[PDB]
Design a protein around this ligand. Structure first.
Ligand SMILES: COc1ccc(C2=N[C@@H](c3ccc(Cl)cc3)[C@@H](c3ccc(Cl)cc3)N2C(=O)N2CCNC(=O)C2)c(OC(C)C)c1
Length: 96
């Protein structure tokens, strides 16, 4: 079966975060250095919540400037409603 052959070894699609992103994920309670992309997104959400980087009045707005997270994103701020910067950063910082 060619569909099985294709997907064997590629059904979970684990990634290894680059060291600066791994440090963010650990800060959010993550353990180890291999994750699903879904786990990476969970821990990034949790990081923003526990470091209080979001605007209490406009909770979709993240103010990441002067945080390691803003360094990785290359941004002072972003909206979760317009997450192009997060896509860019994860493409660059998640290995295989
Ligand atoms: C209206 O207020 C909201 C609405 C949605 C999100 C959100 N939306 C989720 C989301 C957003 C964009 C992408 Cl590409 C993926 C997931 C996810 C998330 C995951 C990673 C990052 Cl870096 C930021 C947010 N994510 C969250 O992490 N949320 C989900 C809802 N409530 C929360 O406390 C946490 C949100 O996130 C805060 C952390 C800023 C706030």
């Amino acid at each position: 079966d060619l569909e099985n052959l294709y997907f064997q070894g590629s059904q979970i699609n684990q990634v290894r975060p680059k060291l600066p992103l791994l440090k963010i994920l650990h800060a959010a309670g993550a353990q180890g250095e291999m994750f699903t992309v879904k786990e990476v997104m969970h821990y990034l959400g949790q990081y923003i919540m526990v470091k209080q980087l979001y605007d209490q009045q406009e909770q979709h707005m993240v103010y990441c400037g002067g945080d390691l997270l803003g360094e990785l994103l290359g941004r002072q701020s972003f909206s979760v409603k317009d997450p192009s910067p997060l896509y860019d950063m994860l493409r660059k910082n998640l290995v295989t």
